[PDB]
């Protein structure tokens, strides 16, 4: 298990545009188009992406590339982010994996705002924490996948995805 499987796992894999959770255009594993109503704005943003004329359908091989390029930009925002920076140094590396998976989810921007989770995981408390993270929208609205990223803060292991 690694942060590629992880979000694999939880984001699917398909080759056409089709909408996310929040009904919001998408493409490959995850790969937000844009919150346009609009399926031709999409489209424009998909060909964008992959440097061609797509007509909204991709490869596997594409989808991967998005793919890499989301989870490698997700983990520069942390980075770059103050709020989030530190407690992903703090994190053992499963740890910092759920962490990755939140921001691919939600934006950079939406965890920072976990403020209070943010501290319990900083300073350790992982039944504390996972408590805190679930009183949130993201819990209610995908409590599955929720459940899988809070059970890999509390452990520290990869045991919820360990048979999917
Ligand atoms: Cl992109
Ligand atoms: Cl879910
Ligand atoms: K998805």
Same mark, same amino acid.
């Given at each position: 298990?690694?942060?590629?499987?992880?979000?694999? #796992?939880?984001?699917?894999?398909?080759?056409?545009?089709?909408? &996310?959770?929040?009904?919001?255009?998408?493409?490959? #594993?995850?790969?937000?188009?844009?919150?346009?109503?609009?399926?031709?704005?999409?489209?424009?943003?998909?060909?964008?992406?992959?440097?061609?004329?797509?007509?909204?359908?991709?490869?596997? &091989?594409?989808?991967?590339?998005?793919?890499?390029?989301?989870? &490698?930009?997700?983990?520069? %925002?942390?980075?770059?982010? =103050?709020?989030? $920076?530190?407690?992903?140094?703090?994190?053992?590396?499963?740890?910092?994996? =759920?962490? #990755?998976?939140?921001?691919?989810?939600?934006?950079?921007?939406?965890?920072? %705002?976990?403020?209070?989770? +943010?501290?319990?995981?900083?300073? $350790?408390?992982?039944?504390?924490?996972?408590?805190?993270?679930?009183?949130?929208?993201?819990?209610?609205?995908?409590?599955?996948?929720?459940?899988?990223? +809070?059970?890999?803060?509390?452990? %520290?292991?990869?045991?919820?995805?360990?048979?999917?």
């Amino acid at each position: 298990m690694n942060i590629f499987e992880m979000l694999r #796992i939880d984001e699917g894999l398909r080759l056409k545009i089709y909408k &996310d959770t929040e009904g919001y255009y998408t493409i490959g #594993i995850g790969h937000l188009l844009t919150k346009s109503p609009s399926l031709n704005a999409a489209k424009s943003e998909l060909d964008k992406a992959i440097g061609r004329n797509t007509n909204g359908v991709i490869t596997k &091989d594409e989808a991967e590339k998005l793919f890499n390029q989301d989870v &490698d930009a997700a983990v520069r %925002g942390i980075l770059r982010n =103050a709020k989030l $920076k530190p407690v992903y140094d703090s994190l053992d590396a499963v740890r910092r994996a =759920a962490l #990755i998976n939140m921001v691919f989810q939600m934006g950079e921007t939406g965890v920072a %705002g976990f403020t209070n989770s +943010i501290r319990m995981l900083q300073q $350790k408390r992982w039944d504390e924490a996972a408590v805190n993270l679930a009183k949130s929208r993201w819990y209610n609205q995908t409590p599955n996948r929720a459940k899988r990223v +809070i059970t890999t803060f509390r452990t %520290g292991t990869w045991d919820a995805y360990k048979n999917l």
